[PDB]
């Protein structure tokens, strides 16, 4: 299945994943395409606390969902 995430570079990337993939695996895939190491990714989707050890299917994250990397910066 495809998954999307909005980057910190004003773009959108796509990932190929399976429902059994953990959030940890997704973060590693994000490290592959972006540069962000996993421990710097602040990843959010639909108010869910995406714990590294649980899975996409655990969080009911379905086909073509969009996750978001955040820095929460203001000015």
């Amino acid at each position: 299945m495809q998954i999307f995430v909005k980057t910190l570079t004003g773009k959108t990337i796509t990932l190929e994943v399976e429902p059994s993939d953990t959030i940890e695996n997704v973060k590693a895939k994000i490290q592959d395409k972006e540069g962000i190491p996993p421990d710097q990714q602040r990843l959010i989707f639909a108010g869910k606390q995406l714990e590294d050890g649980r899975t996409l299917s655990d969080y009911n994250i379905q086909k073509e969902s969009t996750l978001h990397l955040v820095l929460r910066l203001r000015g």
Binding site: Q2, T9, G10, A46, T66, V70, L71, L73, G75
Partner: protein, 407 residues
């Protein structure tokens, strides 16, 4: 020294959009492509007179930085509001295209799930157990949606109103799923996961319905909040804005797979307190720098701009231009020069004539002419304390770039 050129703005509350526009204008001049420039102008909805002023700024010698006056009178008044408008509007555009994919939805749903947990329990419903949420995650609570005045008040009255129907809608769908799993023997573990999913999906639509209801009242409130003059921009809206400026579209395929398609790709990076990220990404074309969560500024990549003035020379120009708006209109009845700005104009041209003069002998005579320009205005500009000090400060700045000027 990889990337140390920093350019500030006047921002009163508009630092983000000023900083984006300055960063963009440096890019557009570096990529001297007339259809990239015109397409972005079209995306920003600029009128032709504003395009004319900006196009003349893009005509500027690519080896000279934009001055504060060019920035303060041309770039931020035009592009500050234009980029603010586009960023606020594309937020709603994205929400109308696919609401579930929007940062607004993913951030606001946290409050919606929390509130429905509380209201479900006020209604003595056991569905309150299917939610884990104490509204403590800063990854969500620091979203811009929660800084909109009264939005959470309105969300609280919507949730309390709509709770009984949510309970009844859950019951119907759980009845249906029990009859669909008639023939299976489900543990207590599986039944709880099935229920949480049914409630999850209902609550997600509650978040979108709240924003869309009453002719998109609350969705419009968020757009105009982002659009109000001096409202501090967050990085959520910076990214929405850069998606818009590039013309990003998520488009489906022959095979049915979605991939992002751009009109004009521009690599954007975000720095914090001057420092680049620890990791390696691209070599960026636009850099936005956040300072202590209170200011935004522009870092110009070396590959995009390089000034060929020493900084001793750059300080001298900037000081002359800042004499020109502070004192320029005052009268100086000396030969051609009626205004002090007429005199400063000729001083600036004389420094450029010194720099480009071919040999040391010809440079000395342009230096001599520079001194005679100073001689012509000295009686009346020493006839005032503030202008006497400015004439003195001007002279010392000039002396410090003499080693640079003599090459």
């Amino acid at each position: 020294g990889v990337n140390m050129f920093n350019v500030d703005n006047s921002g009163k509350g508009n630092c983000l959009y000023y900083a984006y526009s300055i960063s963009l204008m440096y890019y557009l001049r570096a990529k001297n492509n007339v259809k990239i420039t015109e397409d972005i102008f079209n995306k920003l909805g600029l009128k032709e007179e504003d395009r004319a002023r900006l196009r003349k700024l893009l005509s500027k010698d690519p080896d000279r930085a934009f001055t504060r006056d060019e920035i303060k009178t041309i770039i931020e008044p035009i592009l500050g509001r234009a980029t603010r408008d586009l960023a606020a509007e594309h937020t709603k555009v994205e929400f109308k295209s696919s609401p579930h994919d929007t940062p607004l939805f993913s951030s606001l749903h946290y409050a919606v799930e929390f509130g429905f947990k509380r209201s479900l329990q006020i209604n003595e419903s056991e569905l309150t157990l299917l939610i884990d949420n104490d509204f403590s995650n800063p990854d969500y609570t620091e979203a811009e949606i929660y800084k909109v005045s009264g939005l959470l008040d309105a969300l609280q009255e919507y949730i309390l109103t709509r709770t009984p129907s949510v309970i009844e809608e859950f019951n119907r769908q759980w009845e249906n799923k029990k009859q669909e799993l008639k023939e299976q023997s489900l543990t207590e573990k599986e039944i709880q996961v099935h229920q949480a999913t049914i409630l999850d999906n209902i609550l997600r639509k509650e978040t979108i319905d709240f924003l869309l209801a009453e002719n998109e009242k609350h969705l419009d409130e968020y757009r105009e909040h982002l659009r109000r003059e001096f409202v501090w921009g967050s990085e959520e809206t910076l990214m929405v804005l850069h998606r818009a400026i590039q013309g990003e579209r998520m488009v489906r395929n022959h095979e049915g797979r979605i991939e992002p398609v751009y009109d004009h790709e521009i690599i954007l990076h975000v720095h914090r307190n001057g420092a680049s990220p620890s990791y390696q990404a691209g070599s960026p074309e636009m850099i936005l720098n956040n300072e202590g969560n209170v200011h935004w500024t522009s870092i110009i990549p070396d590959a995009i701009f390089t000034s060929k003035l020493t900084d001793k020379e750059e300080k001298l120009l900037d000081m002359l231009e800042r004499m020109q708006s502070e004192y320029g209109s005052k009268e100086l009845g000396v030969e051609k020069y009626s205004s002090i700005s007429d005199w400063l104009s000729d001083l600036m041209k004389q420094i450029e004539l010194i720099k480009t003069s071919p040999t040391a002998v010809t440079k000395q005579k342009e230096i001599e002419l520079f001194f005679q320009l100073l001689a012509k205005a000295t009686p009346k500009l020493a006839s005032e304390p503030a202008l006497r000090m400015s004439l003195g400060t001007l002279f010392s700045n000039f002396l410090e770039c003499i080693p640079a000027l003599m090459v």
